[PDB]
Design a protein around this ligand. Structure first.
Ligand SMILES: CS(=O)(=O)Nc1ccc(CN)cc1
Ligand SMILES: CS(=O)(=O)Nc1ccc(CN)cc1
Length: 291
């Protein structure tokens, strides 16, 4: 699918928190725009003068992610991170001129992303005790991917020797987003495993970390918890479930056309890293039917 590119596929069925290092450095920040950051300031002033209740927030910026040689001991992943903001996102990735900033970045820095905010998103493939994944319908009133299907997630907000605290906030934030939006108790959720990193080509290449989380509740109990919050307890307008059996072929369904690019990323990485068995037993024709 051309609206999603894989930056990273994790080994071993996905990486726990203890196997990831982060390097948070101003060397990983966005570069100042060619004619100056005054362009970002002008877009922000126009937006506030229309919507004065808006506020800025800091974000992590993804620079790059390097996997160790497979089968090695020690830390398996290095995440290179900078800092950005909602304001910088609205003035770059979301700008009408975002494709021009990518061309300029290639020319000036040999890096299509050099002049982009590129805030790091998080998302979950969330599995129930009865083997379904959880999907959410987006409001038709929001600016981004209105009315489309999504998975749980949300752009983490800042605050290996501050590195480990940054990895902790990324893993924490995926569980926190599931509690806030799906209304599940924290104690029903497994520690997340990182499946990979996917890039949204419809948002100038901004990246999301995609995780696997297991819930001890059935689909029926997850639905009850979500609905029991009422319309004000959640940003989404509805919840639904697809058997993990059927997720394998999702790209061939009519649902695929309704999935926002970052949820497409979560499903592709789930299928490659948690699905696609490698051993004789799970690989046998009766358990892995052809076609
Ligand atoms: C309103 S929202 O969709 O919950 N937005 C959001 C989601 C996740 C994080 C992570 N810190 C921050 C903000
Ligand atoms: C392809 S299928 O006929 O929809 N059935 C299927 C799908 C996935 C698995 C792996 N658990 C097993 C069976």
């Amino acid at each position: 699918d051309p609206e999603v590119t894989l930056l990273l596929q994790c080994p071993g069925g996905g990486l726990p928190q203890e196997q990831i290092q982060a390097e948070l450095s101003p060397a990983h920040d966005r570069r100042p725009l060619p004619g100056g950051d005054e362009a970002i300031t002008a877009i922000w002033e126009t937006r506030l003068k229309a919507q004065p209740w808006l506020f800025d927030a800091p974000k992590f910026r993804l620079h790059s992610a390097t996997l160790a040689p497979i089968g090695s001991r020690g830390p398996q992943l290095l995440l290179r991170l900078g800092l950005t903001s909602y304001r910088d996102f609205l003035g770059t990735n979301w700008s009408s001129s975002a494709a021009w900033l990518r061309q300029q970045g290639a020319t000036d820095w040999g890096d299509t992303q050099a002049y982009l905010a590129d805030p790091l998103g998080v998302g979950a493939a969330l599995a129930t005790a009865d083997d379904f994944l959880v999907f959410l319908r987006r409001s038709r009133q929001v600016a981004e991917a209105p009315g489309l299907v999504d998975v749980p997630g949300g752009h983490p907000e800042p605050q290996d020797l501050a590195g480990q605290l940054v990895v902790h906030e990324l893993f924490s934030s995926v569980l926190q987003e599931i509690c806030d939006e799906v209304n599940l108790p924290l104690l029903t959720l497994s520690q997340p495993l990182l499946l990979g990193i996917a890039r949204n080509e419809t948002s100038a290449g901004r990246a999301s970390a995609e995780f696997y989380v297991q819930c001890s509740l059935t689909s029926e109990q997850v639905r009850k918890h979500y609905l029991s919050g009422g319309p004000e307890a959640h940003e989404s307008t509805g919840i639904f479930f697809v058997e993990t059996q059927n997720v394998r072929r999702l790209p061939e369904t009519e649902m695929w056309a309704e999935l926002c690019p970052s949820a497409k990323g979560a499903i592709i990485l789930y299928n490659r890293v948690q699905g696609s068995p490698t051993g004789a037993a799970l690989g046998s024709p009766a358990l892995l039917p052809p076609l």
